[PDB]
């Protein structure tokens, strides 16, 4: 489903932003 695609991509984005947050510090 399109909304499930959106949720999965947003979860990937959350993971990548967490990685960036911990790469900065």
């Amino acid at each position: 489903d399109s909304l499930k695609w959106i949720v999965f991509l947003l979860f990937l984005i959350v993971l990548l932003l967490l990685a960036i947050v911990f790469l900065l510090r």
Copy 2:
């Protein structure tokens, strides 16, 4: 429904971006 998950993940993304802003500042 997945609108709730979308809003939850967008909220997480806002929090992570604000964290990045404070880390850069």
Copy 3:
């Protein structure tokens, strides 16, 4: 509604990304 809150959060995300670009410039 959920759509309005999604738009609001994406607007916040754009603002935070502008803050990031400004801090990086």
Copy 4:
């Protein structure tokens, strides 16, 4: 509509992330 607003915001986000990439690369 709200879907077009979301598309505009996501496109601006893509452009800003491209700006960040172009800033970090060189």
Copy 5:
């Protein structure tokens, strides 16, 4: 299709965040 545009833009965002992480490391 608007949802297709949303999914594709989020996929591009995932790719760009991947590139950002790769440049940060």
